[PDB]
Symmetry: D2
Subunit: 363 residues, 4 copies
Amino acid sequence: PHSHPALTPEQKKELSDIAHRIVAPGKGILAADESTGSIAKRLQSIGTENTEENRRFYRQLLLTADDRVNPCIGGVILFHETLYQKADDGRPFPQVIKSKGGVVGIKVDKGVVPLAGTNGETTTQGLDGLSERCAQYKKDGADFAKWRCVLKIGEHTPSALAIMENANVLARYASICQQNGIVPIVEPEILPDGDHDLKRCQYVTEKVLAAVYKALSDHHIYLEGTLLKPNMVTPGHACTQKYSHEEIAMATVTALRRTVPPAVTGVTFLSGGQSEEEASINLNAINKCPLLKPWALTFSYGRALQASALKAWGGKKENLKAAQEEYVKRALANSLACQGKYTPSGQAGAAASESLFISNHAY
Amino acid sequence: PHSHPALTPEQKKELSDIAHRIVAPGKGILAADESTGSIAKRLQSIGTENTEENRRFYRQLLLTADDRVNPCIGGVILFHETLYQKADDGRPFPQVIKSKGGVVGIKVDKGVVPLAGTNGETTTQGLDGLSERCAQYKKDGADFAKWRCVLKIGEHTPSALAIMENANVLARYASICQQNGIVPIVEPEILPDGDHDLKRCQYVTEKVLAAVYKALSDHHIYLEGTLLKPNMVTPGHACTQKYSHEEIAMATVTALRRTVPPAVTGVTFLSGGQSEEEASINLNAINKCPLLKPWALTFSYGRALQASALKAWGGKKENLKAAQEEYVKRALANSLACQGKYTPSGQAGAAASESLFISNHAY
Amino acid sequence: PHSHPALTPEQKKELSDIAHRIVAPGKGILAADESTGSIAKRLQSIGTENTEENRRFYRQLLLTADDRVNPCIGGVILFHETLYQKADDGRPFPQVIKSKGGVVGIKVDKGVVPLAGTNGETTTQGLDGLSERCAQYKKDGADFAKWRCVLKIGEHTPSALAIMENANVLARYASICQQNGIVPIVEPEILPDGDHDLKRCQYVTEKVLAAVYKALSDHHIYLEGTLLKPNMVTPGHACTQKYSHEEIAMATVTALRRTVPPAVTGVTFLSGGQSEEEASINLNAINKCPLLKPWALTFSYGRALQASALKAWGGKKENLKAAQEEYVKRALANSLACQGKYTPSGQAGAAASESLFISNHAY
Amino acid sequence: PHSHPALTPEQKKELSDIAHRIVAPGKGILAADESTGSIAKRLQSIGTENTEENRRFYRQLLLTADDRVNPCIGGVILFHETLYQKADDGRPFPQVIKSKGGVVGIKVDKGVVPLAGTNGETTTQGLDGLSERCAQYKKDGADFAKWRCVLKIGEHTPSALAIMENANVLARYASICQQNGIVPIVEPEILPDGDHDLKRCQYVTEKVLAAVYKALSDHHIYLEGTLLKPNMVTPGHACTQKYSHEEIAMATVTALRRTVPPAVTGVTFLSGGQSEEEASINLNAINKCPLLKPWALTFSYGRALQASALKAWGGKKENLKAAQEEYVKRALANSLACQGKYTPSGQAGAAASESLFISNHAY
Ligand SMILES: O=P(O)(O)OC[C@@H](O)[C@@H](O)[C@H](O)[C@H](O)COP(=O)(O)O
Ligand SMILES: O=P(O)(O)OC[C@@H](O)[C@@H](O)[C@H](O)[C@H](O)COP(=O)(O)O
Ligand SMILES: O=P(O)(O)OC[C@@H](O)[C@@H](O)[C@H](O)[C@H](O)COP(=O)(O)O
Ligand SMILES: O=P(O)(O)OC[C@@H](O)[C@@H](O)[C@H](O)[C@H](O)COP(=O)(O)O
């Protein structure tokens, strides 16, 4: 009979197998995909000129940390330039990543662009020629990709248009990726900017994710062959009201349970500005939340895995080891965190629970 | 938007507790909500006059079955008439149901109506004065409701309009119910009529459910305070190709995992014309399907729980006891099935977890 | 995704012929469809008891005005009760209306109901059994109907949900009407309540009408067989900034030109609280607006045609003539207005300039 | 309350003024924007090598036709390459166009791309860096742009996804253009391929356009600053039923009246494979259609203005004069057609004194 499925069972198996590898138990993602202009600001914060060699050295610094990170890193997201650079031993970075047990990912969006008629809202571009790009990236060692849409909570934002448009472009991106054997990481980041409280973020997150999945369905996206990279549900950066990690965890898990189909292979949280410690603690609380979570809940951190490393390096080659040690430190912390076994202190623990605390209908 | 939550933490807790009671481990729902017109067909099928007394006697037959059904029945759906009838001992049927540990339910839709401009498609009516009806039903013993929408698989159905409209009306229905302390069972039934295959039914079910949940989100429905009543995923009635129960189970569970948020408290399958044994076996296979299932997967059967009871009764007072044994038998069978413990032996349960080496990428 | 003719060519002609008849040059609509509870309030503003006879007498007063109203009134909307009432001469009100060359219309909605999760927003009920009601109304003399949805401008309103839902139910209402030979007047009223300015009302009116027509399209509605009853575009009742009639006319015609397809037979403005004189003057400025207007632009007034009459009557039968004279005054004025030939009289100003605005909140 | 206007009054004025200039009475558009690959097909049909010089000479040939085309061409669409080429006299082609009273247009889409999971349907790419491209084009002489989406009528096409996606990307393209002072020509072309009949094409065209305008509204598009470039409503190429030009005209105008807001400045039909004569005769019948049309109905022809000229040229510079004469004849023909004054094989006549309103409802 008449039938035109988007993928064959062979294409589905390849995508599903890749997605599961990335978020296998205890593993997370290192998001080191900052574009030229963005990494330039990072290097600037430590008085380091933004040359290709310094970008190569910094990326090599993270990608070649010792084997203690192997069990912690299921994947590494790179920016185009880096995907084609090499370590001092002549090995292309994709080979270095793979030799350490990681799956190579490539950021494919081309930045945000303003949505006319909105209060400073944006959508994301990068769809032009994406299919050919994906085909080339695949041949060059990449198995997954990343695309970032940005939404903001404000007076009249996110608006209906911004929500619908961003969800739609994510679906287009995901569709093209899957046609090329690349697992798409869908990143609809809701910024923490503003003074909104926890319930407001949870509400917006629920509305945004519902839109994202309806769009993924309309575009015939194979969910088992994807990963979701959302913001955790937290109060606004300037929210006067304060909250505990357990509340943040409850709000986040609740929002996800109400919008993310169990078919989605994994949820890899962005750190969104949270300190390295805060990001690890919250991820740990999320994994210890009493609710049933049918998908891996791990990390895809940029700042939360590089903050201390960048600083320790200071743009000086003699600080290589010390810098790598800071990164390992966070890779190890978050690996435990995505399993709910993180105790902020040293590395050893004992107990891990929070009995006598129910009633979560306040969410 | 983002103005005034639909439910307080108190209302949420009430709706959630009710929903969970209905689908507690080993429990399912008896769907005896046939309207006067539909019950006439059943009675006529056994040479029995369609009088209010015969309807009462029949419903009494099912509701007063012995204590063996107590742990099997978490809820009972009734038609308006029956909610206000009494057993021979003078006890209102709702009291009879509650005394056996069941939650009382009430059907609130007013039948299907044709959608102009479509190929024989419909939407369902019954929203007028629904809030008032719900407040009254709640007061009179009902804690949940049921609303049925009907869709068909055909050359050009379900159409975009049918999918959209039915999803929207279901959302309106659920919203009104939740404002009145009533748990809404959302029933988007896709008829098994036609010669379409299993893959086609899975496809359509996936599209329908994605639409159903997007609408529930748009209407601010509290998912934890709802239940889903969908068709299992099966080939069309006239489909020549044959499938196994494992294939029906796999297709069904896959469809649900790709569309139903984990927040949904439970899925209560309609039997849709399957024989009593067929409905029990598929339900059992569904619960044995190796994939992760974040919600209760049980029954809300009408024909699958009454077929043999109705036949044995035959409208004859003398067959009351024989008729009840037939109903109890199915009640016990499905109770085991919703736990994946149904074997033709009965209480014994050694044969389980059969096979394992399989591929779900074919779905 | 093919075409399944909702209407035959014969049905289309009937609906189109009716629509054009109602808004023929120089003609408008008398909206006397206030329900028992709404009319009761009008009778209390004149110390008149709300009795069936008083409602009948009042309706007879308007409907039996001298022949001067014949060229002015293309149609009259009635409430259910009045449709089956008779004049002192024994003639059913529909026969009376028809003998004066007017088309009989029937209000069929059942009032607004609250949308949970919104900031005091509503949708409208009345679809249940609407097909049968329309069939009977048709046999009893009615050729068109009216259904009112209510939207409010404020902080966060109209919400995406309120706009979507109200547009969809209007579409359902219109579909059922056309299946029974009744022309549906689609009324998506955006209340004037608030301190918003002209451009804000224009903005919201454009978004609302865009939604209304997309919905009408999705439901396969025959536009030539419909009429639109919108609010004129004006500043909020509490706006400080003042505007001329030319500006109001410009904003109104512009919003309409940007959303209403030329196929729509006519636009019949509701007066929404404006005084009899203001409503006429604005309708006149609208028809004088230089921009191309592909549809008839006339009136369908309730308050703006009854203000002075209800007053002159005072429930005292002796004031029959005086009261009827005030009604004729406004019909003639509006008849000229919808032709762009009205210049104020300056005679009857006892209640023709009074603000007929009414607070809107709660039930 | 800000509404966040996408455009200021001056920006609107500029776009509106440009749109009206292109479709001024008696004027149409020459679509000579064939990309390198497409123009290759045209040149190969006449045994000519596809070199830049040959393309430059051919475009020069059209752009430099004598002054007789001046009153006929309100705008000329160019492909990027041609926008920066010069005539033999050293004048930039844009300068040539403007010196003859024409507005310069630029095609900005980057071709169609397959939509995964559909039956050979596509969407269009080209949004990446479009803002900067539009700013550059504006500075270099262009005042309007063109973007083509392609949909097809088939057993299951256009699908809901195809319609939704194409309408959305058209809205994004239109939004970016208007932000840069460029008038966007929205071209949602429904191919004539297939054996579907006239009513079928009319149905799909109505649905596609309704989707297009809802999307434009959602994206805050200033309609008075746009032009619509749709297919005329005709039977599929393989349709065995025959229709008159009057029938084609009725269906076309009817479809447009039911979906295109009067605010739209103009409708510029694509020829879509029709012969030069057919395209002219149909455009003429459309302009003579008795129904009310609130927008200019003219041409934006590619093949219908070049067929004979391309053939007469044959890649031989010695055929310049002959080639140009064929183009001049077609420009004159369509200029008359967009005024409803075209008569092939007998350019002579004088009538038109009545109007009336009769027609039928078979559309
Ligand atoms: O400025 P660019 O070139 O667009 O790069 C953006 C990129 O860094 C982000 O999308 C991160 O991959 C992701 O959001 C996690 O980052 P954190 O929020 O954990 O730091
Ligand atoms: O004809 P009516 O008055 O509308 O009643 C319909 C009602 O019986 C059904 O909705 C069942 O509750 C449900 O679909 C399970 O039925 P089964 O498919 O298991 O027989
Ligand atoms: O209170 P009910 O029973 O729902 O009746 C409502 C009805 O009067 C209105 O819908 C008018 O037909 C229309 O809005 C024009 O009224 P004006 O705005 O011209 O006064
Ligand atoms: O193949 P490309 O390089 O994408 O170019 C397409 C371009 O020729 C068309 O979009 C015309 O501007 C328009 O559709 C009218 O063409 P006709 O239908 O009148 O021939």
